[PDB]
C-alpha cells in the first residue's frame, strides 16, 4: 500500500494553464447558483435547495453552513467537497486561532485559512 | 476553593466562591471559577487553576466542533467522557478537579471529575479545600425533589460554609442555574457578604512626592508619513 | 552582612552595615552589628545574630569580673581567648559566629582578633567578615596604609562598607563607624547608605555606572 | 516519639446558655480495622467536668488514670473536697495542658487531642482544647480531627460568636450536636454509629448519655444512582 | 516522625509613640486551612506597664509569656517590689529565649511599654533571643505586607517635599495615639484582605503613664 | 575554568582571562588561552565545565565565520551576542546543557564604539562597562565601581585591570597562574604579551 | 536553586481613571551579587505593555517571542494587537510549556484602542490569568507589593496621582527585598500618550 | 472496598458496598461498583477508581465491537480482555476486578483478576480491602447450587461483616442478579444489614 | 500466628496454633504459644517471640511475688502488670498479648493488650496475623454462656479457618481450659481440623 | 590548614609550614605560624581542622611545659612524640575527635641526634628522615627520595626544601602563600626569616 502518489497531479501545460484548476472551475460552473449581497448593517447569502428526489428530506442537506457564530458559508459545485471543507474550516478556526487568542477569527483570516487548504490540494502530492 | 453542585426538580445548579490564592496570599479577591463548556453545560474547578481553565476550554472547544459535526446540542456525558480520558492519559499531572453540570436533550446531569480520571455521579457534590464544610451543610439540609429556589439556597449556603470556615475560600458566591427547556442563567456575584469596610485614612499622596530622575515620551505609534 | 576592622597609626577603625535578612525578606535595616563589650572593647556581629549578641555581652561580664579580681584592664588577647575557648566547647552544636574582638591596651597597642565558631582565633591587621566581605576587602587592600589619619581611616572604613552595601544584596541599610583608642572607643555615627551613596558618588566621582 | 496504634476519632462540643455539651463515638480503630466498638471516650471528672479525648487510646487510658488519681489526691487533707475546694474544669484543664506540653517538650508526646468541657463554681461555661503539641485554644464550638472540618461549620451556624450563647437553648444545642454526629457518620471512614453524649448544666448538673445511635439517616436516594457516568442500567 | 512544632498563624504589630506605645494583634488562631478560634487573645498585659506577645507556634508563645509573667513576679520578690523597666524586661526575655537555643521557642516575640524617661518603647526578638529596641515592628504571617506600609507612612520613606523634587525629605513629625491607631487598623484591614490567616478580630493594647488600655475591632471573618 | 574579566574603555574592550588549567589535584597547564576570535573585531572569552567550554566556543566561532563568508560582511557585536545568547538559552533546556559562561568584547565599526557583553550559561545577557563571571566579580567589582570612568584610555584600563588582578592574587585561595590580556579596538584584536 | 528568585526583581501594574500604570525595578543579580542596574523588565508591542519578572533568560526569551508573535499578528490582522487579545496569547504561550515552563511572572497593561477601557492582567508561570480590576503584582517582593497596593490603592485615580501611588508602592516594597531595587521605571499610559519616568531610589 | 461474585443454580450474583474513600474522608458514600461491560456480563471493581473505570470502559468498547462482528461474547472472553489489559499494563495499574456473567450454554461463571493480571475461574470470588475479614465466613458458608434467595442472604451476610470491620467499606449493599430471566438490581440499606 | 481466648459458662478457654516462622521458613512447627503466668492465669502470645517471652517471664515473677505477699491475684491484676510493661516500653516492644484467667468470684475473664499497650476486657478476643481472616466468622458464631464442648468447637473451627488462609499460622491447634475443676490441656492435629 | 613539611639532616631537623589561612572564599591571613615550641629543643608543626589544630597544639605545649617544671628536665623527642600519639589515639574514639595532623621535630641532647616524628590524627606515629601530611607528600616525596642523604648539612637541607616548595608552587592548585621555615638543633629552635 502506502500513498505512492507523492507527485503533483496538477501541473502547468505549455500554454501556462493549470488544467485541473480550470476543470474544477468548470465543475463549479455546472453547480447550482448561489449568491451573496453585502448591506450596510448586514450580509445575506442564498442558494437553491436542488432536491435530488422528492422522497429526500432536503432540510437534512444544509448548503448554508455556520463556520463561526459570526461567519457563514455557501457554495456552488460539488457538495461532498464543500461538506469536508466546512468541517476543516470549523476546526481550523479553533486550532489556529481561538485556542491561541481566545476569540473567533475575523472573516478575512478564516477565509485565508480555507484558501490555504484549497491551494494545497492544487499543489500537494 | 469551595465548589458545589446540587440537583433539583427540573434541572441542576452549581456554585462557587471567588477567592484564588497563592499559598497564604490572596491573588484575586473576585475570581470567576464557574466556567462554560457549552451554553448549557457549565463546570466549576479546583486544584491547579491553569489546568482547570485549560482542560475546560479544550474539551469545550472539541464539544463545540462535535456539536456542529453532529448537528446536535452537546451532552454532559460527552464532556465527561472527553474530560476523563484526557485527564487519565496524563495520570494526574494535569491537576484538574471539576464538578460538571448541565442540561441536554437526555435531561439534567451532575458529575464530579478527579485529576487521575475517575468520575462520580450524585444528586449533591462538593469539591475543593472547603468541600468538607460545604458537604456538612449539604448532608444536613439536602432532600429529594428540591425546587429551583431551594437548590439555589442550599448551594449558596454550602459555599458560605466554605467561605467562613475554610481559609482557602472566601469573598463572594457565584451561581449558575441550568434548568430543562430554558437558557442557563449565570449569576455572577449572587451573594456579596465580604465588602471591605472604609479605611480610616486616605493615602493619596501630594503631587511631586516621588523623586524623579528622567522623563520621556514613549513612541507607541507606528512609523509616520512624510 | 558586611563587617570590617583594621589596625592603623591612630588605633582601630570598626565599620559595619545594618541590614538583617531572612531569605530575600529584609527583616531590618537598623540592626546593630557592633557589640559594645565595654567602654574599651568592641566586637563585630556576623553569622548568628543571637549567638554574637548573647556571648559578646557575656564576654563583657567576664571582662568585668577579670578586672575586679586582677585590678587591671583585661588584655585583648585574654578577652578574645575567653570567647574562642567558650565557642570551642560548643563546637558541633551549631553556633554560627564570625567576629572581630577589637581593643587598644598599653602592653599590646591596638589589637584585633578574628574569632570563629569553628574555634579559630587569629590576630591580624585587617579583617572583613560577612556576605559582602570580598567587596570591602578590595577597597581596603588598595587604599590601606599604616600612616592613615583618623579622618581618612574613618572614611576608608565607611567607603568600604558602602562598596559592599551596593553590590551585596544582603548588605545595606546604614553604616556604623567606631574609632578605638587607648582611652576607649569613640562612636562616629550612623550613616544611611541611601544618602551616603549619592553623596559619595558626586563628591568622589565614583559609581559612574549608576545614573544619579 | 511514637506512632498511634489504637485510635479514637472526632470529639465535638459547644457552649449553650446554661452550660456545655460534648460528644464522641464509641469506636477504637486499629488503622482501617474497626477493632473495638465499646470504647468510652468521654470521661467525667466529678459532677462538673467531662474530658473528651481523641487519638491514641493507650494514652487516653493513661490520662484517664491521671484524672482518677487527681480526684483522689484532691480529697487528701481536704474537708471541702466536695464543696469549695472541689476540682474545677479550669484546674483539670490546666493540669492536662501542662502535662501535654511537658511531654511534647521531652519529644515523647501523649498522642491525643483533648477537649475539657464543664461548668465553673460561678456558673461560667468552660470549654477549652489541648493536644499532643500542648497547643491550647477556646471557642464557642470546639472539635477534634474530622469534627473540626465538618462539625464546627454546622455548630458555628448555631453559635457564631460569644453573643449567640445566651440565645441558644439546651434543646437546640443538643439537636445540632446530634446532627453533627450523623454527618460525621456519613463522611468519616473511621467513625461508628454508636456514641456517647454529655451535658454539663449549671442548674441540672451533669447528664451523661450512653449507647446513643445515629438515626433518621438518608440512604433511599442511593437506589437511583447507577454507574459512574454513561451507564443507564 | 513526630514534629514538635506547629504554625498557629496570626499577625502582631508594635508601634512606639513619643509618650505612648501600642501592641496590636489579630485574634484569629489557625492550623493549616482551619480556624481554631475567632477570638483567642494573643497580646498580654504582663504587669509593670509592660505588654507582650509571642507570635508563631502558640504553645511556645503561651509558655514564654507564662514564664516571663513568672519572672516579673519573682523580680518583685527578690528585689523589694522594684518596677521591672522595659529594657530590663527585654534583656531578661533574651535569656529565656537563648536558654532554649538548641530547641527554640518557635515564636517572634515583641514587647511594648515606656522606658525610664517615659518615652514610648518597643523591643523585637528573634526565636533565639537576639533583640533590639525599635520604633516600628510587625510580626507574624502578614509582617511582609505591613512593614513596607509602615516604612512609608510612619517613617515617611521615599516621600519628599513637593517642589524640591527629591532634594528635601518629608520631615519626621510625631504621631499621636489616635493617628497610630488609624495606621494599625488600616494595616490589619489590608492584611485581612490579602492574607488568609489574618481576620476575625483585632485587639490593641495601648500603654501610657496612666496604665494599660484595651481596644477591640471587628475584622472580616472569611 | 576560573577567572575571566572584561572592561570597556573609551575606544576599546579589554578581556583578561586566567592561564591555569587544573584537573583536580594537579595544574596541568599554566599558559592556556581561554578565548576565541569570532570575527576580526569580535573576541569571546569563556569559562565553565571542562570540554563544554572549548566545544561551545569553537562551535560559535565556526558559525560566525560561516556567516562572514556567506554575506561577505562582519556581524555587529550586538548581533553576535544575541546569537550566542540564543544558543545558550536553547542549551539550558536540552538533554545535557552547555555549562559555559562567556564575555563578548567587540568593536562596532559602524557606530565606532567598543561593546562588552556578559552572558552566563542560562542565556542571561547584559551589556556592561565592565564584567566578570564566577567569583571574579566579588573581588574586583568594588575596585571597578570606584575607579572606572567611561572616558578612560586603554593604558588606564590596563592599570585598573592590574589592580583587579593584584586583589585576586591576594585574596583568592586558588592560584590561577596570572592572566592573558587582549585588546579589541578599531584596528582589530591584539594580545598584551607582557602582564 | 529556585529559578524564580535567582535574578530577583519586581513588576506592578495599576488602573486609574482613563489610564493604566505599569512599573518595575532595574535590578538583575546572581543571587547575592548585583550584576546590572539597567535591566528593564517592561516591554511594549504597539500600545500593549508587558512586564515580566522571574528568571532573566526567560524574561528576554519571552519578550523576543511576543515581539515575534505580535509582529506576525499585525501583518495578518492589519492592526495592532489589543490588551485583552494579547493576554490570551500570553496565557496560551505559557501553557504550551505546561511540563517545562518558563519561570516567569508576566503582567499585561494597556488601554483598548476602540473602547478606551483600561486593562491589566497577571499570570502564574503556567498561564493562569489573574484579571484584577485594581492592581497586579509580580516578583520576589510580591508580598510586599500586595501589602503596599492593598493600603495605598484607591479607584479612579488621575494619571499624575496614580504615578505617585504606584511609585511609592514599588519603592517601599523593593526596599524590603534584598533582590529588588537598584533603580526603578514607571510608565503612565493614556489612550494616545505614554510617559516614562525613572525614579531616584537607594542603591543598596 | 468490599466486593464479591457468587454463582448459584439459576446463574450468578454480583455484590458490592458503596463506600469510596480519600484517606479517611468518604468521598462518595453511594458509589456503584457493579459495572456493566455487556448485557449479561458485569464486573466488580476494586483498587484505583480511575484505572478500573478506564479498564471497564475499554472492555465495554471491545465487547461492543466483538458483538457487532461475532455475536454475543462468552464470560470467558470478557475475562480474557480484562486480563490482557491488566497483565500487559501491570506496571501502571492498580486494579482488582471480579468478572461475572451469564451464558445459556455455560450458565453462571465467575472470574477473578487480582493485581498481577492473572485469571482464576472460581465458584465464587471475594476481593477488596474488606474481603480479608470474611475469608473464614465465606469458606464455611458457601455451597454450590444455592437458590437465588440463599445466595442473596449469603452475599448480604458476608458483605455485612466486611463492612462492619473494614473502615474503607460501607454505605449500602448493591447487588446485581444475572439469570436467564434477565438483569435485576438489588439494594440493601444499613438499617437492614447491620442488625443481621 | 493465630490466637484467641473465649469465655464460657464454666470459665475460659485459650486457643492457639503452633507455627513460628522466620520469613517463609517454619522455624518451629510445634510451638506452645499458650503460656502460664499463674496457676489459673494464662496468656496467648503474638508478635516478637523474644519480647513476649521476656514479658511473660517478668509477669510470672511479679505474680509469684504478689502471691507470696497478698495471696492469689485477680485476672485483672495480671492484665494490669502486662499492660504496664507493654505501655511503658511501647517504643522497644512488638507484643500482642491476650490474657485469660479464672477466678471463683469473677469466673472466666479475657483481656486483650494490642501493640499500643492499651487494655480491653472482652467476652472473647482474637489476635495474631491469622485473626484478620476470622473476624467475620467469630462475630457471627460467638455466643455468651456456651458449654465447654461448644466453646472447644468454636475455637477449633475458628483457628482452623485462620490456619487455612494465613501462611504464618499452622501446625497443631493447642488449647488450655480454665475452670473451677482445674487446668486441662487439649491438642488437635491437622487430620482432625482440616476436614472441618 | 594545608602544607607542612619536615626533613631530618645530619645535625638538625627542619620544619616548613605554609602561611595561608583560608576561610572558604577568602584568604584571611598570609603570615600564620603553624607551629608551637613544646620544649627548648622540641618543635611541633600542625595541620587539620580549624580550631582543633591550635587547641590541640597549645594543650600539648602546656602539658610538656608542666612536665619540664615538675621534673626540672626536658623530655626526649621520642618521649614527647609518644605522649602526643597517645593523646591523638585517645582522641580518635572520643565523642568529637581532634582532627589534627602533626610533625614533631626535636634534637635529642642525650644522644646528640636530630629526630623527626610524623603523627596523623588517628595516632599513627612514624619516625622518618623526611615527612609530610595531606597532599604535600604526593608532590615532594619523589624529590626527597631522589636527593636526600642522611649526612646532608643544614644548608643542603634548605636547598632541597626550596626545590620541594617550588614544585608545590608549580603544581598545587591552592596558593598557600609560601612557608615559614624553622630549624631545630643542639642550640635550640630558630626561624629562617628569609625564604
Ligand atoms: Mg572561656
Ligand atoms: Mg474563609
Ligand atoms: Mg545591598
Ligand atoms: Mg526487640
Ligand atoms: Mg497455613
Ligand atoms: Mg602518619
CSV table of C-alpha atoms and ligand atoms in Angstrom, one decimal, chain C residues 19 164-172, chain G residues 178 182 203-204, ligand 3:
chain,number,residue,atom,x,y,z
C,19,UNK,CA,20.9,45.0,57.2
C,164,UNK,CA,29.7,46.1,49.9
C,165,UNK,CA,26.3,47.6,50.6
C,166,UNK,CA,26.0,48.5,46.9
C,167,UNK,CA,27.0,45.1,45.4
C,168,UNK,CA,26.0,42.6,48.1
C,169,UNK,CA,22.2,42.1,48.2
C,170,UNK,CA,22.3,41.0,51.9
C,171,UNK,CA,24.2,44.2,53.0
C,172,UNK,CA,23.0,47.7,53.3
G,178,UNK,CA,17.2,42.1,49.1
G,182,UNK,CA,18.9,49.4,42.0
G,203,UNK,CA,21.2,51.9,45.6
G,204,UNK,CA,21.8,49.1,48.1
K,3,LIG,MG1,22.9,45.8,49.1
